[PDB]
Symmetry: none
Subunit: 34 residues, 4 copies
Amino acid sequence: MKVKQLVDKVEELLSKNYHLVNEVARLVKLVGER
Amino acid sequence: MKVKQLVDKVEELLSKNYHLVNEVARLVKLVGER
Amino acid sequence: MKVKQLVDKVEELLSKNYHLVNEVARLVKLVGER
Amino acid sequence: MKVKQLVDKVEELLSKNYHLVNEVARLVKLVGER
């Protein structure tokens, strides 16, 4: 199923973005608190 | 429903991005006043 | 159609996270200088 | 919209996301060598 495969890929994309946004939030916190 | 749950997730990440971009802008302005 | 709407939102998120990460790199360089 | 349009877009997003994840890893390493 082409659409099911695409949605699987979007799900993984969204998990990767959840984690990278957390990483960025940490960097931004560290700069703020120097 | 999977697609709806993924839309909820992207919306949460869009809001988190919004506030981080705003925080970075605040910090750049402050650091530039040093 | 739910999938195309999800894909557009993921595109928006990725574009905004590119901007965020660009600005974080700029901020990190700035705080090292200033 | 055709399924093929969505598949091609999601492939583009996956490649763009790959580089985003790698840029965040690069920044996390740089900050961690504080």
